[PDB]
Write a protein that binds this DNA or RNA. Structure first.
Ligand SMILES: Nc1nc2c(ncn2[C@@H]2O[C@H](COP(=O)(O)OP(=O)(O)OP(=O)(O)O)[C@@H](O)[C@H]2O)c(=O)[nH]1
Ligand SMILES: [Mg+2]
Ligand SMILES: [Mg+2]
Ligand SMILES: [Mg+2]
Ligand SMILES: [Mg+2]
Ligand SMILES: [Mg+2]
Ligand SMILES: [Mg+2]
Ligand SMILES: [Mg+2]
Ligand SMILES: [Mg+2]
Ligand SMILES: [Mg+2]
Ligand SMILES: [Mg+2]
Ligand SMILES: [Mg+2]
Ligand SMILES: [Mg+2]
Ligand SMILES: [Mg+2]
Ligand SMILES: [Mg+2]
Ligand SMILES: [Mg+2]
Ligand SMILES: [Mg+2]
Ligand SMILES: [Mg+2]
Ligand SMILES: [Mg+2]
Ligand SMILES: [Mg+2]
Ligand SMILES: [Mg+2]
Ligand SMILES: [Mg+2]
Ligand SMILES: [Mg+2]
Ligand SMILES: [Mg+2]
Ligand SMILES: [Mg+2]
Ligand SMILES: [Mg+2]
Ligand SMILES: [Mg+2]
Ligand SMILES: [Mg+2]
Ligand SMILES: [Mg+2]
Ligand SMILES: [Mg+2]
Ligand SMILES: [Mg+2]
Ligand SMILES: [Mg+2]
Ligand SMILES: [Mg+2]
Ligand SMILES: [Mg+2]
Ligand SMILES: [Mg+2]
Ligand SMILES: [Mg+2]
Ligand SMILES: [Mg+2]
Ligand SMILES: [Mg+2]
Ligand SMILES: [Mg+2]
Ligand SMILES: [Mg+2]
Ligand SMILES: [Mg+2]
Ligand SMILES: [Mg+2]
Lengths: 117, 190, 97, 243, 148, 95, 19, 166
RNA sequence: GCUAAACCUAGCCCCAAACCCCACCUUACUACCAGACAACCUUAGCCAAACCAUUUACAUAAAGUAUAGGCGAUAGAAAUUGAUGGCGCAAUAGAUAUAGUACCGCAAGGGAAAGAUGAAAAACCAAGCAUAAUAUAGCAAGGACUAACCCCUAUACCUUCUGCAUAAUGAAUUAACUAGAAAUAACUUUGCAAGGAGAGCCAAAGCUAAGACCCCCGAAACCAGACGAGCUACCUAAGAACAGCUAAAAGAGCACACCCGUCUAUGUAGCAAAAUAGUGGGAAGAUUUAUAGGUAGAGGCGACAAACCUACCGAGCCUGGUGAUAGCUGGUUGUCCAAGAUAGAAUCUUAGUUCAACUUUAAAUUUGCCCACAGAACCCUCUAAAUCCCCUU
RNA sequence: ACUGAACUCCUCACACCCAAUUGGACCAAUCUAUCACCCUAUAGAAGAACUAAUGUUAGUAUAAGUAACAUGAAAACAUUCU
RNA sequence: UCUCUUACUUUUAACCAGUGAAAUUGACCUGCCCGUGAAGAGGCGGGCAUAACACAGCAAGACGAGAAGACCCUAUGGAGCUUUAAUUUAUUAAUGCAAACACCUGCAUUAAAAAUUUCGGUUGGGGCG
């Protein structure tokens, strides 16, 4: 009889309560006998770096110069990454300079994005 | 009145939101009989006889009557010594102080309606003087009207405006009954 | 108790603002301007009742005829119902017949 | 309040705005034009004026078309502008009697037709009126090509028209291959109806179909900005080198 | 509003209803009093008295041919083509005292009116005007502004 | 009748009145006597002569017909040869 | 015929109001 | 809502002249929004009306009604404030000149009845007001004796005039 | 002196102008598996016709004309002509709106209420009562009186009616809200005038303009489209319960649980919008029952009781047409004056209406009432009060 | 003989007692136009006036402090007892 | 059960304390008898009675509360049902004729099924006559 309360797995008969989740991404599948097969590749692997020797504390000293915000753009990235090599080889096949015709064949395809975060 | 368009409107019991179902049965409840919660009797119900839509009050007096009214206004001003004829509205300066002082010295009213032949040719001095004043109002001859003549205590006219008004108002006398709207060509009507 | 216990804030009306000062000007535009413009053309307001007057039924009929296609859906439904009711009332009810 | 535009102009405004704007001009004009269909279920008045016998005066007479309901099954066949008449009758043909809802349906026949231009046999549910029209036009191809949309009254008919017109425009060698003389004879016979292939493509397309066709025509995967910036930089460096 | 009944409720029967007795305006047989009324031609009368009055006051100039346009311009007659008026008919009224010599063109004319016009040395001709031409001639300036 | 038409907002005319009565511009309504074409074989010559006559109406009947017809039907009609032309005005009428 | 008029319940807010 | 009773303690009289009777002190106290029917409180107010402070406290201490305790607390507070702030010399030298119960702001509730029907309960609240006047309680109005009663009758007889005449 | 009282702006109304990260169709707001399934089809009815059945509306001018029409209620062209805010609301108003929220309903859906300080809070008045219960007797007052009562006079109001104090209706009371809309033709006042009007229209003193007359609430109903078989009727799938005793494979007996509801008492605004206590029928079957699904209103279902279909089914409920209609009932709000009660006819008509009669207003004119003789039938032998007519007055 | 009306006279003044209906003279408040400026005037407008509709909303009464409702006992408030 | 009722217990009840409704209500300073009257008086006329108020019972009256009487009549108000009431066959089923070469379509005829609508008035209440 309650319509304004959110629909959660805590409401409904046993089948409903079992079937609905809470947003947790699936980790595997179910086989005969309701046995859960967990796939390792489906478990997110936290790629935590080595923080030893890292010099960047969470906060920044207040005695730090203030600089104008310059959001990175495609043009800026091209100028700072590709333009030098392009100029050199023009003075002296874009794959050599860096362009990749197709995202297929890459582990990290930019579009459609296939990596987390 | 003729310009008036009252924008007052109220929702009738048919336009008030809801009010479709019968609040309760005819008989057995012991309460008054009703057919909807939006009848005029109910709080928040419709208005039985309220203002309806934008209503117009437009009506036209005969142009002869309106011209005669203009004539009567002019005669009243002249008889009561509120009419002042001028050769021109040219002022020595555009200062509103000069105009107010001149009116006070000549014993004009607190309010003066100055009239000039045409809007475009009105002198710059008088335009500047009267733009800054509230009771000294400068109008073209074509704008003369009974309401403003009565609102303003004194009426200042120029000689060209006098001739203009005489011609326009007298034509109504001795004009035929129209064959078609006077905006259309006539043998002798400008 | 339906009477206020304090004087309402004084209402000051400027009798010589521009609107009141120039009210009525160009009402004689026709007779004083070679009848180039009819005074009704000085009326600013709803398109369907500029220089026109009538009872409620006539006003509703004119509104539907002139701006009916541009009316909102529920407003037009209300206008149709109002025209129906006004027709019934004026043509079937009243002291005189 | 009031809408800026009458509600009945909203479809035209949508046509003027959006992908419909990018639609080709000829197709848009074909959609706009609304030539009245040929009378089918009513006898049109002979002239614009008639001497009414009651008072012996010349009065204007107008042809008010009878509304026709075309069931969707008709769009799969060729009914010669014929359809269901959904109306009412007075029992015993006297207005003082009861009024009853009456539906007049056409007599539909399954027939097989051969299209010379398409060189194919079509089995089509057809009406005797359509058969008479085909006889008058001297063939199914002539009937399809001559009959306008408003009289053809069939999406299948308009699709056949588009196919015939496209083959005429392309002079398709697929028409009777290994028989160029026959192909040329057919195309010459139906020569007068030939139109530019661009128009023939859009002939007989509904508004939604035209929208889809335009979308497919103008869908281009975005060009990587790498290429654009490379072209711009190369051009700029060329200018620097030249000057 | 009275007391109860239909009158107070504002629901009294339509006009012409007689309480169920066959109404007066329906128990009378139909007769063709007004059949074709909208197709009958109508001619505004122009008495010779009126014509002489106009000529005397100078609203109609007898030195030039007088026709429907001149009459309307002088305001001697008001023609309503939309109301099936087909023009002007001369009328013998005032014939005995008519003296002006005029060349007048009208649509109808009585024998006595023609006699008076011709006795005074004038000329009279009956000229037909179909509704469109009648409207144009009565109000030429609006027609000239139509641009046709 | 229809005091305000739904399409024009004007007052309508009861055409049953137009089909039966003639209005003289003076304000009189002429009519034919009921039954003037019925069962004439059983009616005497005097009765037939009475029934074959055109007749006026009461003040109240005239007012009713004026209400039921619009102003167009009360205009001045200059028909070519109106059999009732002379009857469109009253002469030597006192009050 | 049996005549029964269903009870009418007043809106609950009127009762539930509090200081 | 009105709160004039509280303000009544803030009135300051001009200094009395030496040849002037000493003005008895007046202390206005009240308690607002007591969960008690004003009708029931009225009986307690009437009971303690006109009595000395000590006698009123004595009666209230042994009366059983709930409002008795509330009125006793109010009276004790009135005594304390009269001594501390209003310069009343003796605690006991005070008498209840005024004591009344006023309607408070009540709350409406629903009482469910047998057949889907209901009634509107009222969570009744009441105010309580007291004025304490310094000095011994005024003597009770003695019943009028036969002598004074006959005196009034004879005065009525003497007041007679010849009505409706010169 | 308490309840309280007020308050001005939150907003809204009418016009003009202007065109407007992730999740989610599965049980929505649910990361991740072979689909196939796809939209179009006259509105009806109320209502009017005083029933109802054909029928009944959904710029200006031509014109409410031509035409249509149980030729009646009514419907109704075309040619042709030319085409910048507020004498608005201001918290019961204005949007329903502080909100489509709270709350109510299974659902469609229905749908509210209200707030007020100040520059800064980092500073006297409704009802109801209380002060202060009451004294013989009486529509509660009036005439009065020295005096409150005592004395004398006085049968609340509204509506309906022949007639009401009526033991006929409504009303506890305060506050707020709550009900006469308009043509034709007339009348008054202007303007112009044989012409008037700012095309059209009228005109044998007319035309133009203005002023001034036409209410509110209420049915059972009818039709359209949605929503409903979580109750209940029946059914489908797959489940569950039925102690003990007698008998023996039982629509068997006694009798728990369980189902039902015979009779009584209580209750009747109740514990309960159908209950409680006792009593009672069945209780291995045509039984009872949990779960999910199905049949939907021109219908369903029915061991027919016109049963039951979400508490009110002779046909559900919601929304809409809809402000349905009501000759029926009720209501119809400032002061003051004046005139004002009156024959009948027709009518599916006698609860109404149209005409007449009466009544009202304005205007023109001259006779109006009372009434002297004379006069108004025989049938009928006699046979009345009178009447009609009628100068004078 | 007297008492006895709103009959009649007397002093003064007089439009100042019939339902439905009809004619007329005024008019409360509001807004607009001009006045006025401690509450107004001449006009134009209109959601323009409520002792009554088992009227609607809100407040408070009357019925009424009434009908109804509730907590087994002692105690150290551990506990025990019925 | 009753002749024929009595006793006791519990509940209710009454008093004290807390909490606290409902229908109803024109105003009431709310008497009895006879008469009157809109045809049965607390209020009117003639008499009689009459300090003031609480509390508990009673049910003769307030034509008591409750439901705008389900009885009866009326309404040119409804609806349900039946028909051998009037009007229809739009719809299905048949046939027959066309159309096509059995189905479909059009037109007729007959049935089934239904659909819309009505059920006059006077009347010594209505009905019957
Ligand atoms: N009648 C009316 N005029 C409006 C309305 N809104 C704005 N105006 C007028 O619009 C004009 C310009 O309004 P402003 O706000 O001053 O200027 P703006 O924003 O440029 O105006 P818009 O272009 O109209 O939005 C003024 O004359 C306003 O009175 C409205 O709702 N009705
Ligand atoms: Mg509605
Ligand atoms: Mg209703
Ligand atoms: Mg509202
Ligand atoms: Mg009444
Ligand atoms: Mg009556
Ligand atoms: Mg009849
Ligand atoms: Mg319940
Ligand atoms: Mg209470
Ligand atoms: Mg009807
Ligand atoms: Mg009616
Ligand atoms: Mg046209
Ligand atoms: Mg509101
Ligand atoms: Mg008070
Ligand atoms: Mg009574
Ligand atoms: Mg009654
Ligand atoms: Mg009562
Ligand atoms: Mg079920
Ligand atoms: Mg067993
Ligand atoms: Mg058994
Ligand atoms: Mg049976
Ligand atoms: Mg039965
Ligand atoms: Mg139900
Ligand atoms: Mg009604
Ligand atoms: Mg009188
Ligand atoms: Mg006397
Ligand atoms: Mg005023
Ligand atoms: Mg009002
Ligand atoms: Mg009030
Ligand atoms: Mg009331
Ligand atoms: Mg109480
Ligand atoms: Mg009691
Ligand atoms: Mg009790
Ligand atoms: Mg108690
Ligand atoms: Mg008696
Ligand atoms: Mg008692
Ligand atoms: Mg009584
Ligand atoms: Mg009784
Ligand atoms: Mg009773
Ligand atoms: Mg009744
Ligand atoms: Mg019965
Ligand atoms: Mg009926």
């Amino acid at each position: 009889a309650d319509r304004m309360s959110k629909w959660t797995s805590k409401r409904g008969p046993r089948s409903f309560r079992g079937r609905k989740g809470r947003g947790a991404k699936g980790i595997g599948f179910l086989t005969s006998g309701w046995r859960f097969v967990q796939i390792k590749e489906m478990v997110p692997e936290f790629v935590v770096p080595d923080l030893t020797g890292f010099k960047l504390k969470p906060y920044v000293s207040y005695l730090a110069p203030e600089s104008e915000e310059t959001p990175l753009t495609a043009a800026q990235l091209f100028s700072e990454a590709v333009a030098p090599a392009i100029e050199k080889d023009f003075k002296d096949n874009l794959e050599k300079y860096g362009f990749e015709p197709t995202q297929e064949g890459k582990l990290f395809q930019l579009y459609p994005r296939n990596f987390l975060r | 009145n003729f310009k008036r368009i009252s924008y007052a409107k109220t929702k009738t019991r048919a336009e008030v939101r809801g009010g479709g179902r019968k609040p309760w049965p005819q008989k057995g409840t012991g309460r008054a009989r009703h057919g909807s919660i939006r009848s005029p009797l109910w709080r928040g119900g419709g208005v039985a006889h309220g203002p309806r839509g934008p209503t117009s009050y437009y009506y036209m007096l005969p142009m002869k009557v309106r011209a005669l009214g203009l004539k009567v206004a002019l005669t009243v001003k002249l008889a009561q010594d509120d009419l002042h004829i001028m050769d021109s509205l040219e002022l020595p300066t555009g200062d509103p102080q000069y105009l107010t002082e001149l009116a006070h010295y000549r014993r004009w009213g607190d309010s003066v309606l100055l009239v000039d032949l045409t809007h475009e040719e009105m002198p710059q001095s008088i335009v500047e003087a009267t733009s800054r004043l509230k009771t000294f109002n400068l109008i073209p001859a074509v704008g003369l009207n009974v309401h403003s003549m009565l609102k303003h205590q004194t009426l200042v006219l120029t000689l060209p405006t006098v001739a203009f008004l005489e011609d326009k108002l007298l034509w109504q006398d001795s004009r035929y009954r129209p064959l078609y709207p006077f905006s259309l060509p006539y043998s002798d009507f400008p | 108790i339906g009477i206020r216990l304090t004087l309402p804030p004084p209402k000051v009306v400027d009798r010589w603002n521009e609107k009141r000062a120039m009210f009525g000007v160009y009402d004689n535009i026709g007779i004083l301007g070679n009848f180039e413009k009819h005074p009704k053309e000085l009326i600013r307001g709803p398109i369907w009742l500029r220089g026109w007057k009538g009872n409620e039924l006539q006003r509703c009929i004119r509104k539907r005829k002139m701006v009916g296609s541009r009316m909102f859906a529920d407003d037009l439904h209300n206008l149709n119902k109002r025209i129906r009711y006004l027709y019934k009332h004026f043509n079937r009810h009243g002291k005189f017949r | 309040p009031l809408h800026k535009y009458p509600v009945w102009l909203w479809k035209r405004l949508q046509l003027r705005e959006g992908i419909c704007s990018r639609l080709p001009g000829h197709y848009l004009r074909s959609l706009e034009e609304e030539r009245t269909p040929t009378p089918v279920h009513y006898r049109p008045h002979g002239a614009k004026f008639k001497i009414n016998p009651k008072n012996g005066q010349r009065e204007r007479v107008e042809d008010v078309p009878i509304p026709i309901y075309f069931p969707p099954e008709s769009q799969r066949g060729l009914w010669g502008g014929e359809g269901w008449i959904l109306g009412q009758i007075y029992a015993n043909n006297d207005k003082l009697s009861k009024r009853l809802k009456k539906v007049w349906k056409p007599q539909l026949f399954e027939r097989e037709f051969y299209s010379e231009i398409l060189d194919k046999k079509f089995t089509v549910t057809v009406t005797m009126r359509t058969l008479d029209l085909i006889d008058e036009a001297y063939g199914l191809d002539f009937y399809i090509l001559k009959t306008p949309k408003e009289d053809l009254c069939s999406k299948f008919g308009m699709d056949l028209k588009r196919g015939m017109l496209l083959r005429l425009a392309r002079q398709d060698p697929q028409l009777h291959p290994e028989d160029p003389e026959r192909r040329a004879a057919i195309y010459d016979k139906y020569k007068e109806f030939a139109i530019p292939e661009e128009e023939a493509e859009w002939v007989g397309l509904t508004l939604e179909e035209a929208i889809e066709k335009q979308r497919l025509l103008e869908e281009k995967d975005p060009v990587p900005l790498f290429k654009i910036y490379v072209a711009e930089l190369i051009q700029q460096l060329q200018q620097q080198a030249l000057s | 509003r009275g007391h109860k009944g239909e009158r107070q409720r504002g629901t009294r029967p339509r006009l012409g209803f007689e309480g169920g007795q066959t109404p007066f305006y329906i128990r009378i047989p139909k007769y063709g009093f007004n059949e074709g009324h909208s197709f009958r031609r109508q001619y505004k009368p122009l008495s010779l008295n009126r014509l002489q009055y106009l000529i005397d006051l100078g609203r109609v100039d007898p030195s030039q041919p007088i026709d429907l346009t001149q009459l309307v311009n002088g305001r001697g007659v008001t023609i309503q083509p939309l109301k099936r008026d087909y023009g002007v008919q001369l009328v013998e009224e005032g014939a005995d005292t008519f003296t002006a010599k005029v060349n007048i063109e009208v649509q109808l004319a009585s024998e006595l009116a023609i006699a008076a016009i011709e006795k005074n040395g004038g000329v009279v001709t009956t000229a037909f005007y179909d509704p469109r031409s009648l409207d144009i001639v009565c109000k030429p300036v609006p027609f000239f502004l139509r641009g046709q | 009748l229809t005091y305000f038409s739904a399409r024009k907002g004007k007052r309508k005319t009861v055409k049953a009145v137009i089909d039966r009565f003639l209005r003289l511009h003076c304000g009189l309504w002429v009519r034919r006597k009921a039954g003037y074409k019925k069962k004439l074989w059983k009616k005497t010559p005097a009765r037939k002569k009475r029934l074959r006559e055109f007749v006026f109406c009461n003040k109240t009947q005239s007012k009713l017909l004026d209400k039921m017809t619009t102003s167009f039907w009360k205009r001045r009609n200059w028909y070519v040869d109106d059999p009732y032309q002379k009857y469109h005005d009253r002469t030597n009428l006192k009050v | 015929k049996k005549r029964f008029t269903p009870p009418i319940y007043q809106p609950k807010f009127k009762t539930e109001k509090e200081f | 809502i009105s709160r004039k009773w509280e303000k009544k303690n803030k009135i300051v009289y001009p200094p009395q002249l030496p040849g002037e009777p000493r003005r008895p002190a007046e202390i206005y106290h009240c308690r607002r929004q007591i969960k008690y029917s004003k009708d029931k409180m009225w009986y307690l107010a009437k009971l303690i009306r006109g009595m000395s402070i000590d006698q009123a406290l004595a009666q209230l201490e042994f009366n059983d009604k709930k409002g008795a305790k509330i009125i006793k607390e109010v009276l004790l507070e009135a005594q304390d404030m009269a001594v501390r702030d209003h310069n009343v010399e003796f605690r006991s030298n005070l008498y209840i000149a005024e004591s009344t119960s006023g309607r408070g702001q009540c709350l409406k509730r629903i009482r469910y009845h047998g057949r889907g029907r209901f009634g509107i309960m009222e969570k009744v609240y009441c105010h309580y007001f007291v004025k304490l006047v310094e000095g011994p309680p005024p003597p009770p109005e003695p019943p009028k004796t036969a002598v004074a009663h006959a005196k009034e009758y004879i005065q009525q007889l003497r007041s007679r005039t010849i009505v409706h005449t010169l």
